[PDB]
Design a protein around this ligand. Structure first.
Ligand SMILES: Cc1nn(C)cc1-c1cc(C(=O)Nc2c(Cl)ccc(NS(=O)(=O)c3ccccc3F)c2F)c2ncnc(N)c2c1
Length: 404
């Protein structure tokens, strides 16, 4: 029951972290006095392992892609050592109490997307993203953690200019996480990088639902994926945060692969915006449209479907202290999204010199202020974000949209 030694890598075959890939076992081990994980490879996977190690050795590194430390070989097996991680994203979701984690789950999703964007920018599609192979690091000195993409057994490096790859070369992926175009009977378009986005969208929902899947329970998932039968039950249609998440996740898991946002679009989505940045978006919109004509395309687009956004009369859905202070020197259209944004811009720009009873009912700039409105108008941000895509090419909106 002693310790094995192959080069600089040492591990006791008792400390097993997990199995997989028929024969390959992942042990906990040691390399250069560091805690590491060691994957043992049979002779039948020597070719594949050499191709994946070569792909990471040659490719640029990134905090959210797993970095290997060392590879060893004896006359029977090949070994790969990477940094020891605290858990897979799956064990994290199953086992951690989220009540005491704050925004750490969202950060893991942002980091996973950062890693994916890096991979796609090197022309690498992953093809097998799932909670089981997204690794969660040990804490650093300040107690913070990060997600890292692992398991490149199915990944492909596309040639330059090539948008796509053939869906018949290789295992399709892991059942329940495979984009529908990898398996559907009638498919005229080859898969592309958006297969990773579909898988990422399911992971997004799995984390924020703490274990559910957009396409149902295990045995129904892959069939529901082919049908398009998705359900985001845990996202309440009238909570501002759930509306924002539903807007992103529904795009990511869309049946049409060309409707799915790129990893770089996903990184720009308000799903990741801080409260302050949300308020900065509201002010930049209000300033951008202040002198636009009501007949212009931007304002016309912003107002379509806006009556439901503002709840018919937004003046009747705020507090009385704010109502009284809006009648001081001008008038507002209660059914205009643009005028609701004007009111927010003015109260933010004159907040210091507002009455004390008004500053109390609003809360402090910016976090309590912006929540005052998004809690009352849960669709305001989602609707403004879609509507102002007409300006996504403008320098002023580069913080909010991916373009060029
Ligand atoms: C199973 C299982 N079941 N359960 C319940 C947990 C686990 C598990 C799995 C792993 C794990 O599999 N590691 C790992 C290793 Cl060691 C080696 C290579 C790759 N991938 S790779 O693409 O072959 C590749 C090839 C070359 C270069 C880089 C690279 F990634 C890799 F992903 C864990 N690794 C660390 N810490 C854990 N706690 C950890 C737990």
């Amino acid at each position: 029951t002693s310790v094995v030694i192959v080069g600089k890598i040492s591990f006791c075959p008792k400390d097993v972290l997990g199995h997989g890939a028929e024969g390959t076992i992942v042990y906990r081990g040691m390399f250069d006095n560091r805690d590491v994980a060691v994957k043992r490879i049979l002779p039948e996977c020597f070719s594949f392992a050499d191709r994946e190690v070569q792909l990471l050795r040659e490719s640029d590194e990134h905090p959210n892609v797993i970095r290997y430390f060392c590879t060893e070989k004896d006359r029977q097996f090949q070994y790969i050592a990477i940094e020891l991680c605290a858990a897979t994203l799956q064990e994290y979701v199953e086992q951690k109490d989220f009540a005491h984690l704050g925004l750490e789950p969202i950060t893991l999703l942002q980091q996973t997307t950062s890693g994916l964007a890096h991979l796609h920018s090197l022309n690498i599609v992953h093809r097998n993203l799932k909670p089981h192979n997204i690794l969660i690091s040990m804490p650093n000195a300040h107690g913070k953690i990060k997600a890292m993409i692992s398991d490149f057994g199915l990944c492909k490096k596309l040639a330059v200019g090539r948008h796509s790859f053939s869906r018949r070369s290789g295992v399709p992926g892991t059942e329940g996480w495979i984009a529908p175009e990898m398996l559907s009977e009638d498919c005229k378009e080859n898969p592309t990088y958006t297969v990773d986005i579909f898988s990422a969208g399911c992971v997004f929902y799995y984390v924020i639902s703490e274990g559910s899947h957009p396409f149902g329970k295990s045995l129904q998932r892959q069939a529901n994926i082919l049908l398009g039968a998705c359900s985001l039950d845990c996202l309440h249609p009238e909570k501002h945060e759930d509306v924002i998440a539903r807007e992103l996740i529904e795009k990511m898991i869309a049946m049409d692969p060309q409707k799915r946002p790129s990893a770089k679009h996903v990184l720009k989505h308000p799903f990741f915006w801080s409260l302050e940045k949300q308020l900065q978006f509201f002010q930049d919109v209000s300033d951008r449209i202040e002198k636009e004509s009501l007949d212009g395309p931007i304002v016309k687009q912003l107002e379509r479907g806006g009556r439901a956004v503002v709840k018919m009369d937004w003046r009747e859905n705020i507090t009385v202290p704010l109502q009284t202070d809006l009648r001081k020197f001008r008038t507002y259209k209660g059914g205009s999204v643009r005028d609701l944004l004007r009111a927010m811009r003015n109260k933010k720009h004159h907040y210091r010199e507002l009455p004390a009873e008004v500053r109390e009912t609003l809360g402090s700039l910016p976090d309590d202020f912006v929540c005052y409105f998004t809690s009352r108008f849960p669709h305001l941000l989602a609707h403004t974000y879609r509507a102002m895509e007409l300006c996504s090419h403008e320098r002023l909106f580069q913080p909010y949209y991916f373009h060029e």
